[PDB]
Amino acid sequence: PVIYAQVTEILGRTGSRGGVLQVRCDIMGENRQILRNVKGPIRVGDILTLLEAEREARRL
Amino acid sequence: PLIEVDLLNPTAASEAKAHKMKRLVPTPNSYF
Amino acid sequence: EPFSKKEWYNVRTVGQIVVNAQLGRVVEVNLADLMENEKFGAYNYKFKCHGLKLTTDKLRSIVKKWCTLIETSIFCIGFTSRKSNQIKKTSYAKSAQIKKIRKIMNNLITKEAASRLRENKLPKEIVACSKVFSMDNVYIRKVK
């Protein structure tokens, strides 16, 4: 019950210091855009795995 | 005004535009 | 089951109400549902087992910053408007011109309402006030 996602673009770094990436993933299952907070090295081409796509982590 | 004009003799057009008391010779604007 | 004692009733039928039949119940229904059309969506109606009210979105979406708010009482509200050839930013009516508008703003309304909407007519009829000041948006916001 884990739904993967494909990164499309990177919106910058947040979280006080630079250790957290705000990327704009999309879900190849149904083409539903989702914005998630990511920790670690990421490029646009790489994909991601999420155990919860229901939370739109816009961070206000 | 900065552009000085003759005021001892005023133009006929400029007289009819000034305030009735501010003309060279104040005249009423009333008829009859 | 704390809901095993509840029997649903009914009220175009626009909805259902749950009871434990008692029914000074007041029910609000959008005019779009009542008239099965989306043109009357910015209105509300109240029924007692009552009244009508302009929706909050439409009340705040018709008030302009640089006009004069004309309001009377069946509540009615109207606004002065700009012109196609108008240049100046501000279009305000004098205190005397407003009283001319208000002397026919509701007087016209009370004329037909007492003698006798959901189509148009009277809200737009009172705008032509136009002979004293240009007016565009006129609504009957609430009826008690």
Place this chain on the structure above:
Amino acid sequence: KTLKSNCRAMVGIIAGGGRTEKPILKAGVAYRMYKAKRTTWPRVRGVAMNP
């Protein structure tokens, strides 16, 4: 208080209002106030009494 709906009640306020706002200034005026009442005016304190 909860009362039956058949109780009669005259509408309005009772006349002679604001009577006590006037300061009785003397002893005599307070003594004449009890002309048509009981006998309780000159009240001697308990602590000014024998045991």
Place this chain on the structure above:
Amino acid sequence: STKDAFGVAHIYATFNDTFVHVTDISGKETIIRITGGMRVKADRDESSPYAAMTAAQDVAKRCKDLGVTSLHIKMRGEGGVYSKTPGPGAQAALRALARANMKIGRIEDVTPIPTDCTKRKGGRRGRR
């Protein structure tokens, strides 16, 4: 229970708490009311979107069980004399409800603005 029916949802989510309150159309008789602080164990987490997201999910379950397959949303914030802006969990609750296969009808703002207001807490100099 019944067949499909139309209800209303009065989501009152301020900066401190989130109320998910769904009644019938008349607004007199309720079905379920789950609060933001009902499903958390910290007084500072009552306004979090996750607290309101979880609350909205369980409201749909009880509304499905009664056949209330749609809801008229009336969204409000504590706008009497205080801030009229709905808190953080206000928008999260609406998104979570519609994600549970709930048909969403009218969305309206019922934040009561003061036509004429009384005094506001704080004094002249405000909350320093």
Place this chain on the structure above:
Amino acid sequence: TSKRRNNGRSKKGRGHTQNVRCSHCGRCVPKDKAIKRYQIKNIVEAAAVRDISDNSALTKYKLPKTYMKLEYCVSCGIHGRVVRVRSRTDRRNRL
């Protein structure tokens, strides 16, 4: 001397204007001295605007917008980044 020509407020021919309450700290501030901003915001944010349309019982329902006018004072108007400190010759900018 005078840091501002109009003394910060915007009243010229009147000797008194009714006070208003700041929207952030609730501080009594005059009507003209206040910082007035008009906010137009949809109740459903853009991250969830399409979520409603997938499951909406209506047919051509257009989501309304919130209409609130916010008034701030200087103390939390600057602190809230609504306005900033400007240069001496850049203060006269009024657009």
Place this chain on the structure above:
RNA sequence: GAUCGCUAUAAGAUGCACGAGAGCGAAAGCAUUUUCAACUGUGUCCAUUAAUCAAGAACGAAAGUUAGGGGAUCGAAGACGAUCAGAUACCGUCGUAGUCCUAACUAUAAACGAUGUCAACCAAGGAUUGGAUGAAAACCUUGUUCAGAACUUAAAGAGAAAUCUUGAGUUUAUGGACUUCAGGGGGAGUAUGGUCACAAGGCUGAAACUUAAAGGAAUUGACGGAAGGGCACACCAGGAGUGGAGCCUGCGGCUUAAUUUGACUC
């Protein structure tokens, strides 16, 4: 049986959005609808009736006093809960006076445009409120002109400079008319005297003594638990560690006849 939701009832207060460098008012001030002031128009009347004003008088925010009514919201004093070394404060909850109306007092404010009142001249420009006069046929566009709140530019005038230009211009090239105030800083708006007020207090109001500065506008620098833009193993993700144990060594301390001395955050 709180919070929350619909419907009703009564009083208190309030007058959002429209609401503006817009209007009126001598000032204070004036915001729901259903006696007075000013401008303009004027081939109307009087003829110097005029300006400023010691003494004198009216109005005079908020708080405050006295007696009634009202007492919903907020809330000097006060009570709790936090924070802190303490906090008797900022933050949270409650609450008497007060906040409201009437009648009578008090007469002070950053009562500010810190700019007295009347009068003549005064560069350029956009725009606004209320009228009069033309074209465009009440509203909208435009021309002339009177009054009003303001604004932009100035290579000019003034100033110590900031700035002012509907003057803070026409001033050492000094005089249009009138009233008030000030003479280095403290003492001090204190004492005494007089007078007004139910009271708090207001109006008038020095000296003895003490002291080389107090103060005004702008420059540079420094500083900010002010903002904006960049940078650093400064930090994030980590590796090795030191601090813990024995020992080499340096420093302080104790000791001694001497335990030689410089260096003491980076």
